[PDB]
Design a protein around this ligand. Structure first.
Ligand SMILES: [Zn+2]
Lengths: 142, 49, 293, 10, 49
């Protein structure tokens, strides 16, 4: 066949890809990270104790894998928030895609260097970091 | 944020409370515009009463 | 990919790669996964063994569902016997019976969900061939998990590059010539068009790989003259604006891939980059044209 | 525009 | 050494567990602030003195 078809909006694509997200209500995120910390430590232990290889080393990997998978989901947790904050700072000439991408970069830079520390809401910390990142993006765009 | 007049005070007791902000690297004018409109009480404070 | 082809009418890629515009544009827009190559003879040798493994796994889900059904049915029967012993009203009997029956219907339906998923997996496994599409990511995730051995599939402009370079022209040309030698006008016209395109490709002495770019050039600076106003403002041809966008996005891609991140953000950003190059080679060709002022 | 425009002086 | 104790420059190895380990992202070590008091630096001369 050779019939033509309409294009698709890029944003709509963002929404279809993130429709699978399901927030955890800020409660279980602490254990979600305990794993992340355990994985960062287990990976560090893997390098420090690379001298020893065993079923014990694959168990460290189990923690590490728990951390990577747990990290995958944690990042999925906040895309609604980042897209919202980005949309809050539109109308300055930039395509919403560029701002949301920049906020995505800011988030990944944040949470991967964040510790509970029983600090302010993890959601608050992400909002702050992504807001700073998007503000920097707009400023450098001029 | 101050002790009421006529209240007994013992050694080691707090006499007046205050909060000291925390240090976080920031943009002078671009984040100044950002903080004026947003990010209110979004960083930490220490205790130096 | 070069905007002038996957959007042109006729779309040279569509005819050469015998794909509908919908399917082609989907890959361009990082929409759905695609199957590139499959060692069909290698799957065939153990097709019987694969089917037997299917039999045992499906019988396993059959056994677990049957066990669940037996357990729940016995529980409901025991509850009904207890209620009868207590001499309760028939209203309670029907309430409990309906609850249990609905529970068993739900259990059987979930079993059927698993079974139909399994047969969908199979169907798509056996009747699997290039140029096929998988809309839903979850099913593809499942396929690569259960059987990630034979077919390798990924969605991007680079998927097309591997497909075309692995693809051959002379064999398709001969097949189309043979089809033309027969009748059946309806399909014969399509065969004629595809054969024309393929014969043009063959005679050109070139390769289709020119339809996937890796290095766009930039015109000299004078062609895009740069103008300073009374305040030195940049108000010259926006060619500078478009090049700014493309370069900026490429650098964001490079930095992001260096930093490391999951597949979603890569692709989301790549789709964005694909849009910028298409816009630069042409604005307004497809979709909303970019407008600054 | 990626269109190799040769001269073919020959 | 690190200005704070058990703190990488980039915040990668910022958890307490990290000790005597160098962060590749920022190329610093993780130990108490005291170590800052017992490490030295040498300047290189282009002309003997
Ligand atoms: Zn560091």
């Amino acid at each position: 066949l050779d019939a033509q078809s309409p294009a698709a909006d890029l944003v709509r694509v963002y929404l279809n890809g993130i429709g699978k997200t399901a927030l955890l209500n800020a409660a279980g995120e602490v254990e979600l990270a305990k794993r992340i910390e355990a994985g960062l430590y287990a990976e560090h232990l893997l390098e420090t104790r690379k001298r020893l290889g065993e079923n014990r080393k694959r168990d460290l990997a189990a923690v590490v894998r728990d951390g990577e998978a747990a990290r995958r989901h944690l990042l999925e947790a906040n895309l609604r928030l980042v897209v919202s904050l980005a949309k809050r700072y539109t109308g300055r000439g930039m395509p919403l895609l560029d701002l949301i991408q920049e906020g995505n970069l800011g988030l990944i830079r944040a949470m991967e260097k964040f510790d509970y520390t029983k600090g302010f809401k993890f959601s608050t910390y992400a909002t702050w970091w992504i807001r700073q990142a998007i503000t920097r993006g707009m400023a450098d765009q001029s | 944020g101050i002790v009421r007049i006529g209240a007994e005070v013992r050694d080691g007791d707090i006499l007046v409370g205050k909060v000291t902000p925390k240090g976080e690297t920031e943009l002078t004018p671009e984040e100044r515009l950002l903080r004026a409109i947003f990010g209110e009480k979004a960083r930490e404070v220490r205790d130096t009463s | 990919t070069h905007i002038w082809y996957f959007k042109g009418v006729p779309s040279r890629l569509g005819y050469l790669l015998d794909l509908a515009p919908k399917d082609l544009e989907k890959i361009i827009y990082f929409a759905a996964y695609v199957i590139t190559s499959v060692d069909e003879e290698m799957r065939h040798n153990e097709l019987s063994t694969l089917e037997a493994e299917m039999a045992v796994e499906r019988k396993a889900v059959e056994d677990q569902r049957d066990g669940e059904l037996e357990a729940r049915a016995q529980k409901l029967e025991a509850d009904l016997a207890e209620l009868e012993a207590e001499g309760a009203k028939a209203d309670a009997r029907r309430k409990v019976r309906d609850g249990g029956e609905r529970e068993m219907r739900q259990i059987r339906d979930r079993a059927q969900r698993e079974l139909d998923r399994l047969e969908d997996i199979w169907s798509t496994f056996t009747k699997l061939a290039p140029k096929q599409l998988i809309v839903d990511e979850n099913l593809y995730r499942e396929l690569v998990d259960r059987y990630g051995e034979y077919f390798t599939g990924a969605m991007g402009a680079e998927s097309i590059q591997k497909l075309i370079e692995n693809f051959d022209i002379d064999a398709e040309a001969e097949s189309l010539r043979d089809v033309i030698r027969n009748g059946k006008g309806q399909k014969k016209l399509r065969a004629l068009k595809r054969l024309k395109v393929v014969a043009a490709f063959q005679q050109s002495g070139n390769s289709p790989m020119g339809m996937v770019l890796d290095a766009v050039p930039v015109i000299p600076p004078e062609l895009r003259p740069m103008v300073q106003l009374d305040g030195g403002r940049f108000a010259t041809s926006d060619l500078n604006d478009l090049y700014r966008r493309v370069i900026n996005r490429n650098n964001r891609l490079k930095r992001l891939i260096d930093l490391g991140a999951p597949e979603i953000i890569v692709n989301n950003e790549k789709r964005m980059l694909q849009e910028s190059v298409d816009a630069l080679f042409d604005n307004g060709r497809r979709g909303r044209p970019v407008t600054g002022p | 525009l990626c269109l190799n425009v040769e001269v073919l002086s020959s | 050494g690190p200005t704070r104790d058990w703190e990488c420059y980039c915040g990668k190895y910022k958890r307490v567990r990290f000790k005597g380990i160098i962060c590749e992202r920022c190329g610093v070590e993780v130990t108490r602030a005291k170590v800052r008091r017992e490490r030295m630096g040498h300047i290189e001369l282009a002309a003997p003195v």
